[PDB]
Scaffold this active site. Structure first.
Site, PDB file in Angstrom:
ATOM      1  N   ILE A 151       0.798  -1.220   0.000  1.00  0.00           N
ATOM      2  CA  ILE A 151       0.000   0.000   0.000  1.00  0.00           C
ATOM      3  C   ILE A 151       0.830   1.268   0.000  1.00  0.00           C
ATOM      4  O   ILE A 151       0.344   2.322  -0.400  1.00  0.00           O
ATOM      5  CB  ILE A 151      -0.968  -0.003   1.203  1.00  0.00           C
ATOM      6  CG1 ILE A 151      -2.021   1.110   1.060  1.00  0.00           C
ATOM      7  CG2 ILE A 151      -0.221   0.165   2.518  1.00  0.00           C
ATOM      8  CD1 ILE A 151      -3.155   1.043   2.072  1.00  0.00           C
ATOM      9  N   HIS A 205       6.081 -12.214   6.317  1.00  0.00           N
ATOM     10  CA  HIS A 205       6.058 -11.946   4.883  1.00  0.00           C
ATOM     11  C   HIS A 205       7.393 -11.422   4.437  1.00  0.00           C
ATOM     12  O   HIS A 205       8.119 -10.819   5.225  1.00  0.00           O
ATOM     13  CB  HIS A 205       4.974 -10.929   4.533  1.00  0.00           C
ATOM     14  CG  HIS A 205       5.069  -9.656   5.308  1.00  0.00           C
ATOM     15  ND1 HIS A 205       4.683  -9.561   6.627  1.00  0.00           N
ATOM     16  CD2 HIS A 205       5.498  -8.422   4.953  1.00  0.00           C
ATOM     17  CE1 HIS A 205       4.869  -8.329   7.053  1.00  0.00           C
ATOM     18  NE2 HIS A 205       5.378  -7.617   6.059  1.00  0.00           N
ATOM     19  N   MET A 206       7.688 -11.637   3.156  1.00  0.00           N
ATOM     20  CA  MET A 206       8.839 -11.053   2.503  1.00  0.00           C
ATOM     21  C   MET A 206       8.439  -9.839   1.694  1.00  0.00           C
ATOM     22  O   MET A 206       7.388  -9.854   1.036  1.00  0.00           O
ATOM     23  CB  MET A 206       9.480 -12.064   1.563  1.00  0.00           C
ATOM     24  CG  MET A 206      10.293 -13.093   2.257  1.00  0.00           C
ATOM     25  SD  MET A 206      11.131 -14.110   1.040  1.00  0.00           S
ATOM     26  CE  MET A 206      12.598 -14.471   1.988  1.00  0.00           C
ATOM     27  N   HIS A 207       9.271  -8.818   1.739  1.00  0.00           N
ATOM     28  CA  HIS A 207       9.161  -7.662   0.845  1.00  0.00           C
ATOM     29  C   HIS A 207      10.073  -7.959  -0.322  1.00  0.00           C
ATOM     30  O   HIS A 207      11.279  -8.170  -0.131  1.00  0.00           O
ATOM     31  CB  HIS A 207       9.653  -6.365   1.499  1.00  0.00           C
ATOM     32  CG  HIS A 207       8.902  -5.968   2.733  1.00  0.00           C
ATOM     33  ND1 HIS A 207       7.971  -4.951   2.746  1.00  0.00           N
ATOM     34  CD2 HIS A 207       8.983  -6.426   4.004  1.00  0.00           C
ATOM     35  CE1 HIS A 207       7.494  -4.809   3.972  1.00  0.00           C
ATOM     36  NE2 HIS A 207       8.081  -5.701   4.747  1.00  0.00           N
TER      37      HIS A 207
HETATM   38  N1  LIG Z   1      -1.448  -3.784   0.118  1.00  0.00           N
HETATM   39  C1  LIG Z   1      -1.487  -3.578   1.455  1.00  0.00           C
HETATM   40  N2  LIG Z   1      -0.340  -3.411   2.155  1.00  0.00           N
HETATM   41  C2  LIG Z   1      -0.435  -3.185   3.495  1.00  0.00           C
HETATM   42  C3  LIG Z   1      -1.671  -3.110   4.131  1.00  0.00           C
HETATM   43  N3  LIG Z   1      -1.440  -2.890   5.451  1.00  0.00           N
HETATM   44  C4  LIG Z   1      -0.109  -2.824   5.628  1.00  0.00           C
HETATM   45  N4  LIG Z   1       0.499  -2.986   4.418  1.00  0.00           N
HETATM   46  C5  LIG Z   1       1.959  -3.024   4.177  1.00  0.00           C
HETATM   47  O1  LIG Z   1       2.417  -4.137   4.946  1.00  0.00           O
HETATM   48  C6  LIG Z   1       3.802  -3.919   5.199  1.00  0.00           C
HETATM   49  C7  LIG Z   1       4.140  -4.503   6.569  1.00  0.00           C
HETATM   50  O2  LIG Z   1       5.533  -4.786   6.567  1.00  0.00           O
HETATM   51  P1  LIG Z   1       6.345  -4.911   7.973  1.00  0.00           P
HETATM   52  O3  LIG Z   1       6.480  -3.517   8.425  1.00  0.00           O
HETATM   53  O4  LIG Z   1       5.498  -5.749   8.885  1.00  0.00           O
HETATM   54  O5  LIG Z   1       7.639  -5.591   7.559  1.00  0.00           O
HETATM   55  C8  LIG Z   1       4.074  -2.416   5.068  1.00  0.00           C
HETATM   56  O6  LIG Z   1       5.071  -2.143   4.067  1.00  0.00           O
HETATM   57  C9  LIG Z   1       2.695  -1.836   4.760  1.00  0.00           C
HETATM   58  O7  LIG Z   1       2.754  -0.685   3.910  1.00  0.00           O
HETATM   59  C10 LIG Z   1      -2.823  -3.271   3.358  1.00  0.00           C
HETATM   60  O8  LIG Z   1      -3.987  -3.214   3.838  1.00  0.00           O
HETATM   61  N5  LIG Z   1      -2.693  -3.500   2.042  1.00  0.00           N
END
Ligand SMILES: Nc1nc2c(ncn2[C@@H]2O[C@H](COP(=O)(O)O)[C@@H](O)[C@H]2O)c(=O)[nH]1
Ligand SMILES: Nc1nc2c(ncn2[C@@H]2O[C@H](COP(=O)(O)O)[C@@H](O)[C@H]2O)c(=O)[nH]1
Lengths: 117, 118
Positions: free
Chosen positions: B31, B100-102
């Site tokens: 997002i 999850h992986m980015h």
């Molecule tokens: N497409 C999408 N991405 C999300 C949503 N909520 C959170 N994200 C993305 O999920 C990711 C979480 O990554 P983390 O910070 O846990 O490694 C963030 O980059 C954030 O922008 C959503 O509702 N939809």
């Protein structure tokens, strides 16, 4: 088989390293140039040059890299505070050694994933 | 642990544009993209943090990476390159408690760890 990197010599115990875990599928060893208090490399025992070269039959070993990461993170005392796993591919990723590997990084707040965004 | 919004996306309970889905993994665009390609690759089963993985998850975890390779090729970033990143807990900056992986790519990504101090 095929072009081996120095990581082949590390796994096959042909040159010195600090191996922290080894099984039939993976080997984990401390990075020579640590970028965080914990900096450990986790690699599959077979020669896959880049992430582009992975195949279905590698999936168990690829998953083993991550379960091993979790085991090591707990041993290192960083599991609760947190840590980052990073795989770099080719130029834009800054890959230097062409045998796939995951960096386990922890021991302090690691800041943003990427510079600026 | 409780499910995050990712579970509603995976099971198609809310609108989405899923990039990839099979029995084990689901992928979709972030997002708030941090690179021209910024795609999340997530196991279909809730595993809150990397600390919670076990042997039974290895196939799915491996699938994350083979799916990343497929998506990188589709995105036109496979040759130039890309990074895969998983964040766990505070120090990793994890925000969504479903592992999850980015998949990040499409430009030179800079230092692997930008901030080595404060
Ligand atoms: N497409 C999408 N991405 C999300 C949503 N909520 C959170 N994200 C993305 O999920 C990711 C979480 O990554 P983390 O910070 O846990 O490694 C963030 O980059 C954030 O922008 C959503 O509702 N939809
Ligand atoms: N332990 C060990 N690490 C190495 C050796 N050669 C390179 N490295 C590490 O391998 C990593 C390569 O990561 P890359 O930049 O390819 O993602 C670097 O962090 C580098 O310090 C070595 O001979 N022994």
């Amino acid at each position: 088989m095929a072009e081996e990197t120095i990581f082949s010599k590390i796994i096959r115990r042909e040159i010195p390293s600090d191996i922290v875990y080894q099984d039939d599928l993976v080997t984990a060893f401390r990075d020579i140039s640590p970028q965080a208090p914990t900096h450990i490399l986790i690699i599959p025992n077979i020669l896959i040059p880049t992430v582009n070269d992975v195949s279905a039959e590698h999936e168990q070993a690829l998953g083993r890299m991550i379960t091993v990461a979790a085991k090591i993170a707990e041993q290192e005392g960083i599991a609760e505070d947190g840590y980052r796993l990073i795989m770099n591919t080719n130029r834009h990723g800054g890959q230097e050694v062409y045998h796939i590997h995951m960096h386990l990084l922890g021991g302090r707040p690691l800041g943003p994933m990427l510079a600026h965004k």
